[PDB]
């Protein structure tokens, strides 16, 4: 007769994504396959989408369905080159010939991706400037950034907003990219570099209080903007034109610079982060810097067990009644609502254990989640089966796109727009239950790409990318000295469902438990054709990794079907307005 409760052990599907995991110098690159390609701008582009997502309520609809690629195509970016953007795209796994987008796709299809970005560029501006004189009274949702403003027959389209930014640009701090560096070498931002007096102090002026607080004045040289000679922010071409005026790489810089400035000056969103960073209830696991869903690290098969354990513990939570004579006999309104259910919930588990005969552990879950909820209400407000992407408590520091991290390797991400909001019917951003159920419907072919177009599937990120983050390197590099300026930590793993499979087949070489310790016996300064790296779990140290790798092969194997449909969705229905009358005929059209 003694209950027990541990909130941190059964978080609402939100383990603390700590940085200490990889506190040991462990960075490798034996994953060099034709599909893996460095993408310097990947990081900023990701942030740019993450920002859109977390504040999708403030942005336009057409802005919250951007595919990662829509940025590449839009800003004329190209993966590969560790410097900026590659010269072009590698046509097929074997050609060694590059080509640009105007060759790859069509022009109207490109101007489309371009328009999006400008809308994004103008929306960001107005969001921080023209939307600072707000005077709400309940809830704002009207004044946004119309798709007409961008396509206005005026010149002050960007001219006006930029005028404001050009004024605050100085104080708000320029991005490293554009900051006037000091090649002088004789001066460094960190320490001081200018004495005022060649002699300090010696003969005290008040011997009664020998102190001398200010020996002499020093003057420092902080982060200053690039000269008008080459300052991208003052590009005259940008006014009349759009954001495309700047260099492709620069364009990304600006959009990032904005996504930060806006976060620090937009009276709208800055007051919004406050509303999200000041919850009357703090996350049981404290307030860490980064947060990810449970399954993105625990795994599907491991998160289902955590719920079984949870149920076995919340059963004891009631069977510990030391003085139930007070609750059972006396019938008072307030404490009885719980007591009443304490009888049904028990006469239901007995209506399954005795009414199944080892039928399946499936019914021992799929038909319990609904009734267990009312029980949790009180003890553990959070459990490993609630929709993580539907709780204002985790929202902010939560990190979507996160797919997991493998020890001595790093994290893995995947740009997918529109996480929370409306019509999240198809969105993969839901509780492990509905999620693994949704993916299962595409794997079994029950749900066609057609159903997407029927359930606002186009409100999501059609195309997709699977990136890998070299967190270990970055973590250490930052732990020592901030000489990160010029390094790369983001790496593309695939660009479409097709290559996604190639990556899953490539993922097998690592998940394998090294048993081959003999000789092949086949008898009849660094150069590598493509990829010949298989050995990974050498020592028993990387044992923990083999598992976190396999679980990833799972998510990606199930995420495959739903993603292949999203692709086909945009190919068929190109952001086509479904309508009403036409919405039906397409159903009975039978397209074979």
């Amino acid at each position: 007769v003694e209950p027990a409760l541990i909130p941190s052990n059964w978080t609402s599907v939100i383990p603390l994504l700590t940085s200490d995991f990889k506190n040991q110098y462990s960075v490798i690159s034996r994953l060099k396959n034709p599909n893996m390609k460095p993408v310097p701008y990947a990081g900023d582009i990701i942030k740019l989408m993450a920002f859109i997502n977390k504040f999708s309520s403030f942005f336009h609809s057409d802005l919250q369905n951007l595919s990662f690629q829509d940025f590449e195509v839009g800003l004329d970016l190209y993966p590969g080159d560790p410097n900026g953007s590659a010269a072009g795209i590698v046509k097929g796994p074997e050609d060694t010939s590059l080509l640009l987008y105007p060759d790859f796709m069509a022009i109207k299809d490109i101007v489309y991706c371009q328009d999006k970005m400008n809308l994004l560029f103008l929306s960001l501006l107005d969001l921080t400037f023209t939307e600072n004189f707000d005077g709400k009274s309940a809830k704002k949702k009207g004044p946004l950034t119309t798709w007409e403003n961008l396509k206005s027959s005026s010149k002050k389209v960007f001219s006006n907003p930029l005028y404001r930014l050009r004024l605050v640009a100085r104080e708000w701090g320029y991005p490293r990219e554009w900051r006037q560096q000091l090649p002088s070498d004789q001066d460094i931002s960190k320490p001081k570099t200018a004495l005022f007096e060649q002699d300090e102090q010696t003969p005290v002026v008040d011997p009664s209080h020998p102190e001398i607080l200010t020996p002499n004045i020093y003057t420092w040289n902080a982060n200053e903007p690039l000269p008008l000679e080459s300052n991208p922010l003052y590009n005259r071409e940008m006014d009349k034109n759009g954001i495309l005026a700047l260099k492709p790489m620069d364009r990304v810089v600006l959009l990032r610079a904005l996504t930060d400035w806006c976060a620090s000056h937009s009276s709208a969103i800055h007051d919004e982060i406050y509303k999200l960073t000041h919850g009357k209830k703090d996350p049981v696991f404290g307030i860490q810097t980064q947060q990810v869903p449970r399954y993105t690290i625990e795994g599907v098969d491991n998160t289902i067990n955590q719920f079984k354990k949870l149920c076995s513990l919340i059963q004891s939570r009631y069977e510990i009644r030391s003085k139930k004579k007070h609750f059972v006999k006396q019938l008072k309104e307030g404490k009885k609502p719980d007591l009443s259910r304490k009888l049904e919930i028990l006469k239901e588990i007995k209506a399954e254990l005795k009414n199944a005969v080892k039928s399946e552990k499936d019914e021992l879950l799929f038909s319990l989640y609904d009734k267990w909820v009312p029980l949790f209400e009180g003890e553990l407000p959070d459990q490993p089966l609630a929709n993580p992407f539907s709780e204002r408590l985790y929202k902010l520091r939560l990190q979507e796109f996160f797919l997991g991290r493998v020890p001595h390797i790093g994290d893995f991400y995947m740009p997918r727009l529109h996480s929370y909001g409306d019509s999240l019917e198809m969105s993969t951003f839901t509780d492990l239950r509905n999620l693994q159920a949704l993916l299962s419907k595409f794997k079994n072919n029950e749900y066609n790409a057609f159903t997407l177009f029927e359930n606002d599937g186009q409100s999501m990120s059609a195309q997709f990318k699977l990136f890998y983050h070299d967190t270990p390197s970055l973590a250490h590099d930052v732990a020592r000295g901030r000489n990160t300026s010029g390094k790369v930590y983001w790496y593309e793993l695939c660009h479409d469902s097709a290559t996604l499979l190639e990556f899953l087949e490539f993922l097998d070489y690592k998940i394998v438990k090294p048993q081959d310790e003999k000789k092949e016996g086949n008898e009849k300064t660094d150069n590598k054709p493509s990829i010949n790296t298989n050995p990974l779990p050498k020592d028993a140290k990387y044992n923990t990794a083999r598992k976190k790798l396999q679980i990833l092969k799972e998510f990606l194997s199930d995420y495959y079907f739903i993603l292949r449909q999203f692709e086909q969705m945009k190919v068929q229905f190109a952001d086509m307005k479904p309508g009403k009358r036409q919405l039906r005929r397409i159903q009975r059209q039978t397209v074979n």
């Binding site: 991005p175 000041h278 404290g286």
Partner: protein
């Protein structure tokens, strides 16, 4: 042509305490009464009421019958042996400082501290060179006791020194705290600073980061946190840490002072610098 009664009554020449021979007033009240006799002046009420300042009655006429006689038998201006005193006395007095100028000296000494002669002798250059700002400085303290107002003077100067010393203390206190960790960006843990009465909006890791950057640029008189704000944004780690990224130099310096203060409550046992030279 025109009378106009040209006759200097009893003018004075002693403003607020600008450090000058307190006994000169008497030496002046001799030629100051002579400048009235030589020109023939009639002692009235404007003089007596401005020489004692009292609404007396029967013993009020005596003063009017005194100040009058003092001017009547006022001997020739200070003797030749007394004249040589004039220059000497007033030569010691630093009355050559405008009230506005003086009131700046007792202010710059605040954000610059007691004996920072150069630091203050530069942010003015009024009367003359540094030597002036030093001479009057030494003279100030050495003979300050002769104060006209030390209430809102010797306190507004001292008080600012406390703050300066506290900041310089937090600086040095921080230095030693970092030398206590090999990799501070991980193993750094505050003993007393850990708060609770307020919502910890910042990540525990973040606080650790903003400290590493305070140590990076020290705690200079002015601009400091605007660099932290930059350093934060520059780092690719918090590339998605939206809250952190959104911290303005102001709403970020806030957390800074909070940490410094809390750090102060820790290393306040070893802040006794041995002064036995």
């Amino acid at each position: 042509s025109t009378p106009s009664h040209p006759r200097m009554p009893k003018p004075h020449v002693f403003h607020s305490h600008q450090l000058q021979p307190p006994q000169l007033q008497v030496l002046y009240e001799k030629e100051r009464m002579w400048t009235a006799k030589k020109t023939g002046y009639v002692p009235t009420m404007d003089d007596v009421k401005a020489a004692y300042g009292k609404i007396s009655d029967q013993e009020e006429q005596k003063e009017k019958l005194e100040l009058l006689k003092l001017s009547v038998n006022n001997s020739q201006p200070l003797t030749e042996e007394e004249e040589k005193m004039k220059a000497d006395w007033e030569s010691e007095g630093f009355t050559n400082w405008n009230k506005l100028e003086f009131r700046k000296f007792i202010t710059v000494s605040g954000k610059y501290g007691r004996n920072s002669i150069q630091a203050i002798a530069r942010e003015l250059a009024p009367g003359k060179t540094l030597e002036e700002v030093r001479a009057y400085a030494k003279a100030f303290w050495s003979n300050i006791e002769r104060i006209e107002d030390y209430e809102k003077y010797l306190k507004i100067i001292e008080n600012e020194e406390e703050k300066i010393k506290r900041v310089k203390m937090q600086q040095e206190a921080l230095r030693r705290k970092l030398s206590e960790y090999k990799n501070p960006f991980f193993d750094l843990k505050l003993k007393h600073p850990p708060s609770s009465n307020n919502k910890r909006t910042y990540s525990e890791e973040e606080d650790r980061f903003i400290l590493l950057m305070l140590f990076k640029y020290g705690l200079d008189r002015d601009d400091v946190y605007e660099l932290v704000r930059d350093e934060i944004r520059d780092c690719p780690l918090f590339e998605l840490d939206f809250y952190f990224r959104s911290r303005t130099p102001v709403e970020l310096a806030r957390r800074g002072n909070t940490l410094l203060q809390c750090l102060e409550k820790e290393f306040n046992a070893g802040i006794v610098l041995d002064d036995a030279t």
